[PDB]
Design a protein around this ligand. Structure first.
Ligand SMILES: Cc1ccc(-c2noc([C@H]3C[C@@H](O)CN3)n2)cc1F
Length: 330
């Protein structure tokens, strides 16, 4: 089997991407944030505290004839930005772009943090990291990809995120028309439950490539590119007037600047992020100071190849017995 679904930026800045998902019988379609950095499928629901719902589409398990309460199961998760959600668990039928999983754990939110409440366009998350990270207690549950992959034509999914434009998540096949040149595959460590890999280095603009190992994760659920402070300093030094701001919380730059590209290495291959992918617009409405899309990972503990990097590539998440990651230019 295979599946294919369009993913869409939630706003003009590509702050995140939503993908329609069919849950239950009859189908309840919710727009979920596909997140290769976590492993919970959770949704706004009829159980979510009323005051914490503001515009989201909710899942109502009582109206699904295939929904079953998972007795005694709860979940609770916190994301890298301090955001959180929690609730109970159902099993139900879940379909993505024509690919169907029966008995998928659907985690129904009772509580969500303010950031989720304030984003009316995101109805929940669909985790695509490794199932070892799933938070359901006392019995851990499997991800959508994990449940589907034995049925897939090939145990893979691909992320093809667009710059200010729609893109595609495919399951079970590689669309050879979606990229240029070849796909370069690189080793993955699953020891922390992430799609963790090691970049071979970077360049800034037309500058010479610096060969250096950068361990990080491929994370569709993170907006920006987070890299070591040395690397990030080298990038923003090439932008006149750019500075790291304490009050703002990272590098900002004059909105009139022309941003240089950023290149990262995948083995001997090179993925080039165009400079305008790194522009995240005025820090506040009407400001001439803009937020940078490359930021330091120093306070995080790990480097994160978020959407800023991934959207410059066609990315293969290969879930064979020994998982690997593939990158192609497009
Ligand atoms: C309001 C909001 C906040 C965070 C997230 C979010 N989704 O994926 C992630 C990254 C960071 C780490 O969790 C691994 N994946 N963060 C989504 C939101 F809609």
């Amino acid at each position: 089997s295979t599946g294919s679904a369009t993913t869409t930026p939630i706003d003009s800045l590509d702050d995140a991407y939503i993908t329609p998902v069919q849950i239950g019988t009859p189908a309840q379609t919710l727009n979920l944030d596909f997140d290769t950095g976590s492993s919970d499928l959770w949704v706004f629901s009829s159980e979510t505290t009323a005051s914490e719902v503001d515009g989201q589409t909710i899942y109502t398990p009582s109206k699904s004839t295939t929904a079953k309460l998972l007795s005694g199961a709860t979940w609770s998760i916190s994301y890298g930005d301090g955001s959180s959600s929690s609730g109970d668990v159902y099993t139900d039928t879940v379909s993505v772009g024509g690919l169907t999983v029966t008995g998928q754990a659907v985690e129904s939110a009772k509580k969500v943090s303010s950031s989720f409440t304030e984003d009316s366009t995101i109805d929940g998350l669909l985790g695509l990291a490794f199932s070892t990270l799933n938070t359901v207690s006392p019995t851990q549950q499997k991800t959508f990809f994990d449940n589907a992959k034995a049925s897939l034509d090939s145990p893979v999914f691909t992320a093809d995120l667009g710059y200010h434009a729609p893109g595609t998540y495919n399951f079970g096949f590689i669309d050879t028309t979606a990229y240029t040149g070849s796909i370069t595959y690189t080793a993955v460590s699953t020891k922390q439950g992430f799609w963790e890999w090691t970049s071979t280095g970077y360049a800034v603009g037309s500058g010479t490539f610096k060969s250096t190992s950068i361990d990080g994760i491929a994370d569709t659920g993170t907006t920006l590119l987070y890299l070591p402070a040395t690397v990030v300093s080298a990038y923003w030094a090439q932008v006149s007037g750019a500075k790291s701001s304490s009050s703002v919380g990272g590098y900002v730059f004059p909105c009139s600047a022309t941003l240089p590209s950023f290149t990262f290495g995948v083995g001997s291959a090179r993925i080039v992020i165009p400079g305008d992918y790194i522009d995240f617009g005025p820090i506040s409405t009407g400001s001439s100071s803009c937020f940078g899309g490359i930021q330091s990972s120093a306070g995080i503990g790990i480097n994160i190849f978020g959407d800023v990097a991934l959207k410059a590539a066609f990315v293969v998440f290969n879930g064979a017995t020994t998982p690997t990651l593939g990158f192609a230019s497009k």
